[PDB]
Amino acid sequence: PHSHPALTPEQKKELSDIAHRIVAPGKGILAADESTGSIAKRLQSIGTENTEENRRFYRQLLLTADDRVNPCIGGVILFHETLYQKADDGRPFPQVIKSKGGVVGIKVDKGVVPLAGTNGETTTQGLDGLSERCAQYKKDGADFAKWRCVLKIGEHTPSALAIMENANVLARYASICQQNGIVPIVQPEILPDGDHDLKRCQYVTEKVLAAVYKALSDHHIYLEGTLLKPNMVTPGHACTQKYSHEEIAMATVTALRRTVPPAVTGVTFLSGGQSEEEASINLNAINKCPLLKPWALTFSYGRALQASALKAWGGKKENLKAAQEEYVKRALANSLACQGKYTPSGQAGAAASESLFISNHAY
Amino acid sequence: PHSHPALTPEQKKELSDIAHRIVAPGKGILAADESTGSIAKRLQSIGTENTEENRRFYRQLLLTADDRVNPCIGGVILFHETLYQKADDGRPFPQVIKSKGGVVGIKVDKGVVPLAGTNGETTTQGLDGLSERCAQYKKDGADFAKWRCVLKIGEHTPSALAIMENANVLARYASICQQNGIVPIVQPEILPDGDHDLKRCQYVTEKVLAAVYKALSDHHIYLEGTLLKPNMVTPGHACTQKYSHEEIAMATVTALRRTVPPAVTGVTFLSGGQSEEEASINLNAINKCPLLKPWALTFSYGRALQASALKAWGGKKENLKAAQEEYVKRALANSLACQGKYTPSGQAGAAASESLFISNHAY
Amino acid sequence: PHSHPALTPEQKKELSDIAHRIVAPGKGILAADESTGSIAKRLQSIGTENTEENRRFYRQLLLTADDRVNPCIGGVILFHETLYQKADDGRPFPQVIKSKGGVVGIKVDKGVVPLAGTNGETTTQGLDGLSERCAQYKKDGADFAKWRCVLKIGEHTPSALAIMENANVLARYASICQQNGIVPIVQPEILPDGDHDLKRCQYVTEKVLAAVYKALSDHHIYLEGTLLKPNMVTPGHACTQKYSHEEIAMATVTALRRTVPPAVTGVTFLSGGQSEEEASINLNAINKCPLLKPWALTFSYGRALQASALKAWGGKKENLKAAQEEYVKRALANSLACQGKYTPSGQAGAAASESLFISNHAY
Amino acid sequence: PHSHPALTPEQKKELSDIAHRIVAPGKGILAADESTGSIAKRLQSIGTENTEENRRFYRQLLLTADDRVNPCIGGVILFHETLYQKADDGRPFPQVIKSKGGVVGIKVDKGVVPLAGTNGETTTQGLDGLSERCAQYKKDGADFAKWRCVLKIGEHTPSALAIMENANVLARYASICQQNGIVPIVQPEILPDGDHDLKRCQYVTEKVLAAVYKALSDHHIYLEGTLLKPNMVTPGHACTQKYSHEEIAMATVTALRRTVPPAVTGVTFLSGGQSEEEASINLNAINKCPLLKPWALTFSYGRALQASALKAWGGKKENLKAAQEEYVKRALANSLACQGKYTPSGQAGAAASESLFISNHAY
């Protein structure tokens, strides 16, 4: 082959520094990049009207939490709208985040689209004008981008086409980001839907990650200047078998060790519909695995850090401090979990809200 | 594998019918899809200002060609602007085209962007919202589309990356079109730049087309519902070895036979910076090549069809008829070219001219 | 990519000449390259002993069928052993084939081996020292070779690995043959085993063929100096669905039209467990198909040419002429069929049962 | 996709155990697997005529080294012949190796052959019947195997065909080995020949290694049951720029971190023409590199351990005592280097006993 370096030693350093700040020991990411529609769903759930001020207010609640959260929050992913909003104090949101020590992030993909000739499989769009948008994003304080691709497990899925196409689009996305001084989060999300077991998800996860990394190589991506946002290796939600958190940990860590080169700065896990406490325990178990993990493994949770806070809010202005507190709490818990210092680990008799698929009711 | 019907019998018939209609014996394609920036160039070089009206009247000037052109033009590629323009008679352009018996085409790509880490190589964007766009274009009279990818020959180009990426993006575009009833014209354009010889161009052409058709296969593309708009196999514009028309025909056809499968309805050739006459002589030669050609070998020219017409016009509404006459003659000339029934009134056709590269000034 | 001529003009011409001779109009291939274990089975079924002497006689009988066979046989695929045996007059078997106007071929693969981590899939060995074997084989009268690869349709097969691998091994084999002056017959054989219907077989046939030609292109294979020996697109042997011959014909032609480039000199179909009649009938139908077929569509039958001749001989030298006329009959019949001239023969004792049950009735 | 366990957890256990035993901290591999041809070269140099007895005695000299080498040698690669030879005490070589705590390895490839249509590139053969040989080798005491694949850097090398094919063959060999309980050493050898600089060598290695691991994944290879035998990152033997061992180590470690998954048990570097001292200094530099290294970084030296021992021997039995001491010292010197605890007694000594390899008069 022949080389024509995409980045200079100076470009690589900036990307590497940013990537390292976000996942520094004890820190994770707050995913509060819910689209106007997604957020509308949540706000509706807690009986609050999906209004402009309301959205700007709920984001304030999170980004304006007391200094207690600072060493826990390394990065915050915002939606295009939020990025251009102001706080009560006047300060534009990206500033509030930076003053507290966090790196500003922005979701740039434009949704998933169906791939013809498959069984409900998709790919993601958003590459058009990405360079210009990323250029403008870096200008407006943003440093890391988010892009979501989704894969499904089934009898004939994920197919080779979905694996190939999704891997390629991720590499294209990452390439443009790196050119604009923006560290790209690679997010090949494998859906926990179905009744497949643990090994299956682990096999599929390994296959997927393998393709992903080879594509990044083809597109000449500076891996140090990237972060991996994968799904935890877990059994399907409908799976009848039960698994210990330590099994989940072992599955996940092993899968990553067989595919993710040590050059990748970090792995920020998705909650994948797990409960707040469950997400912590699993994360802690992961960091507690006796296997050599050369990358940082932390969190990139949305609902798993907001659930209780959203409820505590309920759209009530007076519940401000109280709701923020629930978030500060989830914050600390996860700061300890990414360090394997989060005590809550050995618990199951009253920790899993999925015993229905274990009961005779599933047979 | 396992089948998952990308299209129904009905959908396939429509694509095939449209496709076949475009390249019927004696018919070619007029490429009038120059974007605002490219059309400016033309009007600028002749001497008329880049006015919207000047562009509408100009394009009218082509599409209003008397019935003589009817059996010649099977399709016309339009740019978005032109699509919603009306002729002086009040009738919208797509309808005018149709009343003459031609099929309306629409360019859908958004230009080429750079592939980081390459030697000036690019890919093409346009996929975002392309599905909804095609559906709108179809309701509006468009039955086929055009997407231009470009590849270059150089000491280290085209590389594996550019080849894979361009063929992949093309397959994507082809899938989105076929879903919406629009026949996709696949354009893997290899530039004639450089001092490379005929054999080099033939070689890379073969490696490009091969990757392309493997790509269409993976994406489950309906070949019968597509068309290939490639470059003729010729030597580089700065090459020293002079070749006969027969030599370029034989090289072109052999490369196609080695890569393009029989199911592809037709091959619409690009001019490639060739003079109006050169294009007709070459095309004619390819059709006169003794080798078996199972697909249509016709044209999809732009400059080769409107060079003189544009000139004759000179922006003056009074130059109208003569300008139009130039076009008809190039339409007729080529109509016979794609049938191997054409002959320039020379002896062994028109000769070759000022090629400083095939002279003492190239050493 | 970057060229590096694998063959000189003369080498290409040699290969092309040979390939074209084998598939001249009205001609096909006699596949009599049964391995020691294969011919043993057929011999034992009729009670005849499996000795080199018995084999030499059986092969002798076929190889010297009356001159009426000359125009029907373009080539004969022999097993190693036979290439070195002589006819009763002391003349080397290949020379007996050459004398009759036929081309000599040799089996070169070393059989299929299990693929790990698959559902009983395989690949084919035989590469080691193949270039040396081919140089010698060429010296000894062989002009074309045969390499068999087996793919099986199942709920999840052929897998991406089996397809990729089998295509790669074929391309390596072909390359070696072409470097030693021998025409390689690409045999991507999909088994009729299973209860999959026609549609399923066509889809699988199309996916596998695309991969094959991409690999051949990747390994710089000269298509004109190759022959493709595939399966006709038919329903699985266990399929309950009844299909007419015209459907079988349309499916097979459609699949080839969509994947086999026109530069391929010819397609030599194998019988695939069909009866002698079925083989002639389906191939005739194939040559009747109203679609454009740029390549010679012929036969490469083993059982479809011998089954009846084997029942005439029955191990007794007395039945020499009886056996020979049977095969002469089947050759003449397929010669018509490969030209779409075969008149399907009426009830001739068969049409209830063919020849090889195992035997006829013994207690 | 869908899994089909190529190995049972127990087989996986055994493979993992072997791989770990080989590269235990402070241990490395002695590559004494020279073919009859290669060794004859070394013997000629010391006026020793290549004979069955001489070879057997030189191997015995090396293998009978005093017990200090035991904690240095985790394994020894042998050639077929040697596996069945016995030391003067009546016990077969494999038994002795094991007596000294070492694991026995065998070279299984059948050498390289040229790839058609490339700039003199090659691929490796040796797969035919490999499983049977593996079953035999295991029976006789071999626990791991060696397969050499050669890659060359130049103006247009390695080519995609060369990367693709070699990576694929390596994977096929690995699959076969693991099925027989033999730990396969993946050896994608990039030649130091040429005048390319450090940057190019590092860039090429990364691309090759990425391709290799993608192939291993595709073929379902158990990484924990394999080892990697790569070249160190160094400029070509014809390069004129001066590089320090620190730059060498940095380039080397970096490339590995970017491509080799943490699951790979160990990495055994090969001599690469380097002098004995150069090898130890470089291996040590590598271990002293401040970058995170998840896998064991050791050696698999042949000439970098035998050089002075052969010379010392000089074909004189008296020099037996002498020769053995030279070996033990290099081994002890490398046991330390693979632990980053080695130090040169001032200068080195390369140009004095050889003048180096590449291109003095190269064959």
UniProtKB/Swiss-Prot annotation, chains A, B, C, D:
The record marks 146, 361 as: Alkylation inactivates the enzyme. Asn-360 in form alpha is deaminated to Asp in form beta. InterPro entries: Aldolase_I_AS, Aldolase_TIM, FBA_I. The record marks 72, 107 as: Essential for substrate cleavage. It comes from the Eukaryota. There is a cross-link at residue 41 (Glycyl lysine isopeptide (Lys-Gly) (interchain with G-Cter in SUMO1)). There is a cross-link at residue 41 (Glycyl lysine isopeptide (Lys-Gly) (interchain with G-Cter in SUMO2)). The modification Phosphothreonine is found at residue 8. The modification Phosphoserine is found at residues 35, 38, 45, 131, 271. Pathway: Carbohydrate degradation; glycolysis; D-glyceraldehyde 3-phosphate and glycerone phosphate from D-glucose: step 4/4. The active site is at residues 187, 229. The modification N6-malonyllysine is found at residues 110, 311. This is Fructose-bisphosphate aldolase A. It comes from Oryctolagus cuniculus (Rabbit). The gene is ALDOA.
